[PDB]
Design brief:
The complex is a heterotetramer, with 2 copies of chain A (60 residues) and 2 copies of chain B (50 residues).
Chain A lengths: L8 E2 L2 H19 L3 H16 L10
Chain B lengths: L6 E5 L2 H19 L3 H11 L4
Classes of the chains: A mainly alpha (60), B mainly alpha (50).
Chain lengths: 60, 50, 50, 60
C-alpha cells in the first residue's frame, strides 16, 4: 500500500534528535499550506532579475 | 537577523544537492515560520502512541 | 572524476552546517569507499527481524 | 538508556529511501573502520596548506 506504516528501528541519541527534527521540519513544511514559503521563494527568484538594478528606489 | 558571516559549500552531487537543498530550506523555513501545525500534529498523533 | 560543473550554496545556520557537512560527506565517502561492513551488517541486522 | 531502541513510524516511498540511504551511509561511516576517510581528510587538509606552490613538481 502507499500509506504503508513502516518503522525505522534505530538506537543513537544524537542520531534520534537529528533524524526526528529534520524528518518533522520537512514533513510539516509539506503538510502545512506553504503560503509564506511560496511567496518567499518566488519573490527571491524574481528579485534576481531586478538585482541588475532597474527600480528608481529600493531599500532593505 | 544573525551575524555578517555565511557558510559556503562547493560540491558536485546530483542526489546530494536535491536532498541537501530541501533539508536546508526546510530547517531555514522551520526557523522563520512558527510551530502551530507542528505541536498540533505532534499531540494529535501522540494519541496513536501509548 | 565526474562532470566539470559543480553546485554552489550560501547559507548561515549553525546546526544546519554541522549536519549538512557530515551528511554530504557521508554520501560522498560512502560512494568512494566500498561497502564491506554494509553487506555484513545488513544481513546480520536482518537476523534481528522475522 | 543510551542504547534505547527507538522506532520512527513513517509512510513515504521517497521518504523511506532517502532517510534510510543517508542514515545507513552515516551509521556505517561512524561504525566501520573508515581509515581511508581519516587519511583522505588529513591529506586534503595538509594539501590546502601546501597549495601555495612550494613543491619542485606537481602532477595529478
Amino acid at each position: 500500500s502507499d500509506d504503508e506504516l513502516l518503522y525505522l528501528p534505530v538506537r543513537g541519541r544524537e542520531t534520534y534528535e537529528m533524524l526526528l527534527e529534520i524528518k518533522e521540519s520537512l514533513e510539516l513544511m509539506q503538510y502545512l499550506p506553504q503560503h509564506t514559503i511560496e511567496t518567499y521563494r518566488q519573490q527571491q527568484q524574481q528579485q534576481h532579475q531586478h538585482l541588475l538594478q532597474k527600480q528608481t528606489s529600493i531599500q532593505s | 537577523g544573525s551575524d555578517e558571516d555565511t557558510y559556503y559549500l562547493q560540491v558536485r552531487g546530483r542526489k546530494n544537492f536535491e536532498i541537501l537543498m530541501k533539508l536546508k530550506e526546510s530547517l531555514e523555513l522551520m526557523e522563520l515560520v512558527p510551530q502551530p501545525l507542528v505541536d498540533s500534529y505532534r499531540q494529535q498523533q501522540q494519541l496513536l502512541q501509548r
